[PDB]
Design an enzyme around this catalytic site. Structure first.
Site, PDB file in Angstrom:
ATOM      1  N   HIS A  41       0.810  -1.216   0.000  1.00  0.00           N
ATOM      2  CA  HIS A  41       0.000   0.000   0.000  1.00  0.00           C
ATOM      3  C   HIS A  41       0.852   1.279   0.000  1.00  0.00           C
ATOM      4  CE1 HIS A  41      -0.034  -0.366   4.515  1.00  0.00           C
ATOM      5  NE2 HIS A  41       0.309   0.908   4.381  1.00  0.00           N
ATOM      6  N   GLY A 143       2.356   5.720   9.756  1.00  0.00           N
ATOM      7  CA  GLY A 143       3.795   5.712   9.533  1.00  0.00           C
ATOM      8  C   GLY A 143       4.460   4.447  10.065  1.00  0.00           C
ATOM      9  N   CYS A 145       3.499   1.384   9.423  1.00  0.00           N
ATOM     10  CA  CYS A 145       3.411   0.309   8.441  1.00  0.00           C
ATOM     11  C   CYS A 145       4.780  -0.120   7.930  1.00  0.00           C
ATOM     12  CB  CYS A 145       2.449   0.667   7.315  1.00  0.00           C
ATOM     13  SG  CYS A 145       0.791   1.106   7.904  1.00  0.00           S
TER      14      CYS A 145
END
Ligand SMILES: Cc1ccncc1NC(=O)CC(C)(C)c1ccccc1
Ligand SMILES: Cc1ccncc1NC(=O)CC(C)(C)c1ccccc1
Lengths: 304, 304
Positions: A41, A143, A145
């Protein structure tokens, strides 16, 4: 003595954390050998997340669009590919800090340490369990991820998790390092049902053994039970049914304390039926389930 | 979202851990620059620990008697000295992995991460608080001595603790990095009274604010209180009295949530007087006090 929710030393993993930027999005990546792993993503914009067509979105991206930075050095991207929900960015330099490592898919109820990262920089480390419903009750902000979960066996880091998303319920979902989600989750901003969670029975029993080893004995009683009787109680209290495999893994703890597994089951039964009566066990007022029998033995013996 | 007992990434500290052997005893040492710091009881035998005369015992030791090993390399000892309860072994090589660092003496109620080590090798990392009575409820076994507590501010490691001993009560005692014990403890195998401990009120309130930030709001009520009224309740429940300095440090949390500090005090008052009624807050069935207001802000904002 003393018993703590201990995470693995994060050093070997800190040396692998990088920042990955694509367009406007920045998240964490894991640099192992000449490959950087990150959630796919990273290629999406806020509008894309409602129903992203990852294959189409990735086609509009070239190697030069993926900005990978390790502290202050920029890594040169020479290849990009999507494997399930992860992107693998081939870089021209092998990470000099790559430890001995494996990619493993953990089982629900197993534990691991998480090194929460923002902008490729580690902020903290905590121990958690993969819930029976395949979510993790972590601590992650925007942030985070790309932050990973792992276990360490002497010098080998087994990476088991990469963080992808927070469900509307505030619980966390992610993948193994081949990009396969744990659970039915998809990397799409849509309402997603986390299954009914249960308490990890074998872990609570392991933790009861750790309590006895460390002096907390008040919960021990004059009773015993059977697997079938205990499982009738486990059912009523949303505890995972106990099997002979779980009894077998509790063998070392049963041997060290001399308290038969079914006798410890009777203590757990009385604790479930009566509660703690305002008392504590290992500093907790609830039945702890994020310590496996292996975690208990490791901590109680001092394995480095 | 989510709230966890998060430790600092232990990487910078792992790079400093060494093994120190003197005679028959082995423990951990901290290698910073060309100095190795370790508990002075490394020079004692089991018989010596009942009433050790450290000055006399150290006189029988020469530089060559201190075996310092960093993984597989042997460090050459060129100087030895005792400063309070720590030994400083000057080595001929500066640690190439020495991070930016400070030695700090933390205040009771402040928190820190511990990197538990055995034979100079890190086994795990956990977060804890220096109790108001100057003990720590850690997880340490024989061989863990010399393991250190620290905090990290971007690239600077502030070492605040070195582990020395376990009290007969199973709680832990140690020193700052100048060898001064926290509390009235002495490095002697004798019965030692840890003072009456209290709950760190400002930390519980900070944790209540973290609960509100993360969605747990059930404990919020229609009441308020005063510092004097709240402190009458704190007294009855062995909570540290709340001061205007504590209210001031809770300012950022009060600003972010818009819940006045004294209103949060009224929630804590009702929780103390009525208990949790079988409910939980941030996954805990008790009032958590090992998160400072700084820890809460840091975790809730994602400071790396
Ligand atoms: C705010 C936050 C906190 C902790 N963990 C993750 C996030 N955020 C997200 O999950 C948003 C995003 C765009 C990365 C996403 C990813 C997959 C599905 C839907 C949305
Ligand atoms: C078994 C253990 C577990 C955790 N921490 C420390 C220890 N052990 C000790 O404290 C013993 C010894 C010899 C180091 C000592 C030191 C100062 C005073 C009296 C005794």
């Amino acid at each position: 003595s003393g018993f703590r929710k201990m995470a693995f030393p994060s050093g070997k993993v800190e040396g692998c954390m990088v920042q990955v930027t694509c367009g406007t999005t920045t998240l964490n990546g894991l640099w192992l050998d000449d490959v950087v792993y990150c959630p796919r993503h990273v290629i999406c914009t806020s509008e894309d997340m409602l129903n992203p067509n990852y294959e189409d979105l990735l086609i509009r991206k070239s190697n030069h669009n993926f900005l990978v930075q390790a502290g202050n050095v920029q890594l040169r991207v020479i290849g990009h590919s999507m494997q399930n929900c992860v992107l693998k960015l081939k870089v021209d330099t092998a990470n000099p800090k790559t430890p001995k490592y494996k990619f493993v898919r953990i089982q629900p109820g197993q534990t691991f340490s998480v090194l929460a990262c923002y902008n490729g920089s580690p902020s903290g480390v905590y121990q958690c369990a993969m819930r029976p419903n395949f979510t993790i009750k972590g601590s992650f902000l925007n942030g985070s991820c790309g932050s990973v979960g792992f276990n360490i066996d002497y010098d080998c880091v087994s990476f088991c998790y990469m963080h992808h998303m927070e469900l509307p319920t505030g619980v966390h979902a992610g993948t193994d390092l081949e990009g396969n989600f744990y659970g039915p989750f998809v990397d799409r901003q849509t309402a997603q049902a986390a299954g009914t969670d249960t308490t990890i029975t074998v872990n609570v029993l392991a933790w009861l053994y750790a309590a006895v080893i460390n002096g907390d004995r008040w919960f021990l009683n004059r009773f015993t039970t059977t697997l079938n009787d205990f499982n009738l109680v486990a059912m009523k209290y949303n505890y995972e049914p106990l099997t002979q495999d779980h009894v077998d893994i509790l063998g070392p703890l049963s041997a060290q304390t001399g308290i038969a597994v079914l006798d410890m089951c009777a203590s757990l039964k009385e604790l479930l039926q009566n509660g703690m009566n305002g008392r504590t066990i290992l500093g907790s007022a609830l039945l702890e389930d994020e310590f496996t029998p292996f975690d208990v033995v490791r901590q109680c013996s001092g394995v480095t």
